[PDB]
Symmetry: C2
Subunit: 271 residues, 2 copies
């Protein structure tokens, strides 16, 4: 029997088809163009570091789909097709926003400090690629930890909360903000795949719980290192804050990131 | 600039999102259950060889997505996410039909003669897997030829036409038939990817046109070998034909297959 209708990832796959119909081509970015045009040069430089982090972050999950297919986990692989399609819309949405406000050509990589690179240039592609040649429990937990629990479950979740804190209130960038709420919803499913994947391996052998915690801790310094750097950039050129009577509470944001991290650790149980 | 909005595979990707919203979970198979229940044991064995061919044919296209991503073909890779998701629905639809009429447990692999295996067990996974380690023009044309032009563009297209010839007229299996029309539409896009991929490589060096033709010809004997075998099985136990005043014109079907083959060769030009 080809499919287990009761399998959690099969149920997550059904959910993905029903809830992941959004199309980035349907979003109206015209107001966003005006909003970015109305900004001052200084203000313009304010918003770009946060948007740089998202525009780099090619289907990172591809190796995972390959490895789980090879192990015969058909339901996981079905679900992963929706994940990879979500990644495609992700890239599409930011590229349309960038083109709509005229920073399509601009090289935002300058807002990737070293800590960012330690995550997005090394730990993530390395941990995913590994799975082509080594699909051990450790390897899989590591790939799920870095991508699902850290990149998505911590940084992405915190960047989405940040965009809303700043701009939903500013009245700015209604197209981006709609894109972000769709991304955020897609990502709920991604995090559940990660949790399901880590938990099933931990269930098998409690030693893998320590490995999960250890690897969340080893990545923490670069997560907080990138947040400080953005934080510092922000504080240092917050003309946008002055202009839009915004309270960019960087101390709040920072605590939101910490809370995401501890919350992810907490969704994996030793038993 | 991340995306070329004018790129053909980007336009094929936009088309895929708009036209590929079908969900196999939304199909009503209740009548199909009744229809299969109403059949005689003999009749029941009539329909299964054609359905065996489709139920085996895990994301076969995965290696292609990996290789084109590695070569920086971002638009191709976006489109391929829709392809792989279509493959997932494909597997899902047949598994739901099989479960709905009670042949979910049954081992249909017995209707795979050797010629079928030469295609679905060897040429296809071998040609796709190759791309992980060898992504030369030849390798890519070969993968596109076997999967898109032969498996989809010849066998699948001909099996869809066959199901309709037999059952749209019988009044049987309205759920399956609706599934089939969705599959057939998804496959139009798959064939266009294959054509676009083969053509772009041929454009570069006309010697690859000969290689395309040579490899279509080398696969032909197993395509026609599998068709004869089904043909022969059919002729040999056509109680379903008698019962439903069907004219299963096997000579027509056979010519339809030949026509698909020659038609695929014809969609690739030397210049
Ligand atoms: C000022 C506080 C800043 C909070 C931290 C911002 C983090 C930027 C996150 C971007 C990285 C995630 C991109 C890929 C996520 C995905 O798979 O969809
Ligand atoms: C009696 C004439 C028979 C005609 C030939 C029938 C061929 C059966 C085809 C099944 C193989 C294709 C399955 C995979 C296609 C896909 O990628 O969606």
């Amino acid at each position: 029997a080809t499919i287990d209708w009761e399998h959690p990832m099969f149920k997550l796959y059904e959910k993905a088809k029903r809830n992941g119909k959004w199309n980035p081509a349907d979003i109206d970015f015209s107001q966003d163009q005006k909003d970015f045009a109305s900004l001052t040069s200084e203000e313009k430089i304010s918003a770009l570091p946060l948007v740089a982090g998202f525009s780099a972050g090619t289907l990172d999950i591809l190796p995972m789909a390959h490895a789980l297919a090879r192990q015969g986990r058909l339901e996981d692989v079905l679900f992963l097709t929706t994940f990879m399609h979500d990644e495609a819309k992700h890239v599409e949405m930011f590229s349309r926003w960038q083109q709509a406000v005229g920073i399509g050509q601009m090289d935002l990589s300058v807002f990737h400090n070293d800590h960012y690179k330690r995550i997005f240039y090394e730990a993530l592609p390395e941990a995913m690629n590994r799975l082509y040649a080594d699909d051990s429990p450790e390897a899989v937990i590591r790939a799920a930890t870095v991508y699902n629990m850290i990149v998505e479950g911590t940084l992405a979740e915190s960047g989405y909360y940040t965009f809303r804190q700043i701009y939903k209130k500013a009245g700015l960038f209604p197209g981006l903000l709609q894109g972000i709420d769709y991304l955020n919803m897609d990502e709920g499913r991604h995090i559940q795949f990660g949790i399901y994947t880590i938990q099933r391996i931990v269930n098998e052998d409690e030693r893998y719980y320590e490995l999960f915690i250890r690897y969340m801790d080893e990545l923490w310094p670069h997560v907080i290192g990138y947040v400080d750097y953005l934080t510092e950039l922000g504080k240092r050129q917050q003309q946008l804050a002055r202009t839009y009577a915004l309270e960019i509470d960087y101390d709040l944001l920072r605590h939101y990131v910490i809370k995401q991290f501890n919350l992810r650790k907490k969704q994996i149980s030793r038993t």
